[PDB]
Amino acid sequence: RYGATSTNPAKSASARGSYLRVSFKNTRETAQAINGWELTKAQKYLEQVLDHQRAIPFRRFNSSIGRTAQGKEFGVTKARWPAKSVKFVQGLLQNAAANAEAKGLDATKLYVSHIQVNQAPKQRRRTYRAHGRINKYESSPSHIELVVTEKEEAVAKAAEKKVVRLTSRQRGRIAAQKRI
Amino acid sequence: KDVVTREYTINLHKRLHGVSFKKRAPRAVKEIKKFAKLHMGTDDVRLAPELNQAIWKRGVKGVEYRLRLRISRKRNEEEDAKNPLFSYVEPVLVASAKGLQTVVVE
Amino acid sequence: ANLRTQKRLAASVVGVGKRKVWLDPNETSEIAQANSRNAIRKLVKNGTIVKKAVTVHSKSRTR
Amino acid sequence: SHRKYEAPRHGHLGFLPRKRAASIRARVKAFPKDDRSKPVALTSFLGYKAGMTTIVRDLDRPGSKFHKREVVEAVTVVDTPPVVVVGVVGYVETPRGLRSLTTVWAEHLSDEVKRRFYKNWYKSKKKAFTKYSAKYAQDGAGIERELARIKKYASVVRVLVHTQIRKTPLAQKKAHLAEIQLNGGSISEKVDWAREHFEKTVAVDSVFEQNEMIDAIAVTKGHGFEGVTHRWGTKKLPRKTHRGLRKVACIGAWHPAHVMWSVARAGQRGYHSRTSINHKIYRVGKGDDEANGATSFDRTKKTITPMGGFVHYGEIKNDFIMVKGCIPGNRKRIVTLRKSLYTNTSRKALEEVSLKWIDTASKFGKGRFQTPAEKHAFMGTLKK
RNA sequence: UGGCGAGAGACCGAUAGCGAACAAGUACAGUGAUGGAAAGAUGAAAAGAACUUUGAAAAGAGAGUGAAAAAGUACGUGAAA
RNA sequence: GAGUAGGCAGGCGUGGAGGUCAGUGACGAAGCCUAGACCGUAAGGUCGGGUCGAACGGCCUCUAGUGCAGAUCUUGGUGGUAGUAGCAAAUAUUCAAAUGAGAACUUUGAAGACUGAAGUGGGGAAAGGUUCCACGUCAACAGCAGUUGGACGUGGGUUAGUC
């Protein structure tokens, strides 16, 4: 349960959303725009990209989509405003933040440590093509799950020694340069 | 920002100059909303159904060249928005809406 | 807020089209609670519903 | 097999690629040959295209059918408000061509040329040339050293000079700064002229005489994509053509099994940095003058500006140049007029032009009258 | 190689074995004759998740049941693309 | 001491079968995963770690529906193209309130329009079969949306001596 994390469950809260009917490719990209942020800067950013002030940079699923100036912020040329995705992850940010408060984590240092979007089973419809053919018309829903942890500095400090092995010639030259 | 009521003239002629005939009156509605925003700094505009009748009376493609209208920036209620003030536009009744400078009604 | 059975019933009761039936926009609670044809008949007497007089077709330019 | 009926190619293969001239300024790529005898003077001169008018003039061309006969010629006017000197660059000749050794500016740069260096100006603290202006704290020590450098070295000297956009009817405020080469005496004389003229204005009456040929350099009008049969103007294919007429049919053969650079293709055209040559100077008018439009054969108190102003541009209150024929670039554009790179002596040069009448009819329509006094006189006196 | 009643197997083990291990000659196609699928497994026992908190809600994070929820009625194991 | 077609020999692996190791195994069988290890020229074998939960193996022999990359193979699943092509014919919508978590699409009001009585009107035939109507409701469907519906859940409804 909850894909590979390197954070402390005593200082974390999570939120899960299974079989959510959103474009997988759009909701993967909103998640990768929001990943490794503070929860406050993240929540604010998702309302800005709903009212078309900043944009979600599309990095992987960025094929033949229109360019935009609101991409320059992220060092891309191509960005978009996935309303549905942004609204679903917002619902899951809020729900995570609520669990993080209910456990008792300072809501100020709370930063999204893990966010993962998997693919749900595809929902089945049939379109009708020229010369009386049938094709598939599939929705690709999403499995969104995110983690928010308290920020802690003072780490590594790591790790190991210089447990050294020498020869008679090495040790003898060390004993010489000391005598000098 | 204050609670004010002014009477503006809008040149709808130059704003609808070179539009598709069957989106002229709908564009006039949208451009008066843009006009109310520009002058009252307000992201909520509330066109009176009387102003709707005034723009639309002469069909989709017969929007009058000029329109004398009144814009009241008002204190907001009704599930408080992010903007604390909204602008309520009404049509002023003048026989010839031309040669009129912007005034204030108190 | 589903007064389509009330538009339909009003039109059929008064004996005109659904195009010539004015339900009161302020009095909506009452015309929602209107279920019977007897209820509609009572609301047309109160003047909550009217006939919304014919669009005139002058034969004056014809004459 | 061959074309079957061979025609010359559509389009010049020299003006490529047909992309958007990176700047919006004109970019003078060649200056004249730099005569070292005659006194120091500007070569080219920055200015703004205002619009086109008609002229009438007598024609001294012995042998021509129209010898001593009135001829109508089209004319385009360039607003040329005095351009402010604000710097001087020294260029050393190297085995990788000319290179900028250093540039020195005057301490006092106008808010005009300061606005150039910012894109969000009115948020800025306007701190440009604060420390450089404070290098004049003592008797310009940093300045005298860098000017001594440009005198000792630097086989070429150019002047940084900016337009006075405040004087034009344009709503920009952000004066176009340009380099313009000095062709004059010894490099020491060039450096001293570029120094002595710091914080001063240079007008057009000094640089450009009358009856002197000019090279108008500017970026052309936009037009966007502007499809196949308008940019090269290839054949329109027959009415019967499926999938479109407005095209080129055969790109190429196989072998070479690639579309070629020579083939005419679609994509944005217009807004290219073009240079036209041999535009004869007709008028170099002044701003210190009403009766700008007045010839020696008219004597009427009117300005070159038509009735209701130059359409899209405005009124011309500054010293200007009206020049024969069309020159490249839109109205409200930044033009650079450069002196002839050679001595054209084809009887179209050497030819003393004398204007008879300048059109000032409202070219915002089919204007009848030259002045409000003529309109009132012919019509009138109703109803104001 | 039918019907009924029984014993069996160096047979098959859910794409195999009968078309059918399941409400199979069922659903469904075609006017009709006829054509004709896919589809088994939570756990010993439902003990099928009380109760708290976010959300309009679905659900989430807890709490709990369980020998395990890395068994949640999308249920043994859970490969590869 | 080469080798296609081809022959022959020696082995490796799989489902079962007889015999044996008084074989291993809920203190964990088999299965699967493993930039860990060892053996074998190789087919393959063995071991450690994880997951898992009920069977399985060595050896001497018997037997075969016994080993896959190809068959425009079969069935099932999955992709890249791709958030691309596109969702552009039937002139056209707009303002307000109400409802609601949510309204371009729902209800009402108000405009502006169209069909223009060889109609986008009002009935019927064949065909369908409850789609009719009410209440409740929106996971699926209505290639946007959805509070709406010919959808979904529960009910109600078709009266003849003359049709």
Place this chain on the structure above:
RNA sequence: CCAAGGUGAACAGCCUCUAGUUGAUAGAAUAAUGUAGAUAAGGGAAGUCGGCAAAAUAGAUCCGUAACUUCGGGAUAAGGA
């Protein structure tokens, strides 16, 4: 099957009354190329396999109407007002 007013020869086209819909994914911007509509100075088939496509002509009243003919026609010939 029933079938209104006006224009008009008219159940043609165009506009309205009764009655009915306002349903066909929307918002923004107006590059190329398209698709469906249009216009073009002068020339007038030179284009082209070929006048393909479009243009022109058009209702009504009066005038006039040829060769040819199976004596019925051609005929709204043509050409005008």
Place this chain on the structure above:
RNA sequence: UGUCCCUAUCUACUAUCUAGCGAAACCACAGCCAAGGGAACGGGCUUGGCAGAAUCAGCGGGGAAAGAAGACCCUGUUGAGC
């Protein structure tokens, strides 16, 4: 009479950008050229030229592009209509 000399301009709906919804064809691996040799016309081989992320709108040179076990021709001790 824009069929043409010779093209131009305009309107609407597309395209384009956005929110939503969201296919298919095809796909050994793939995608820069020149010559060479070679199943005698290479994306890959040899020798050169060269070569810098991510890409958007167009385009119709190429991919001997896609569609379909050539229907023409021959063979077959394969058939059918006549």
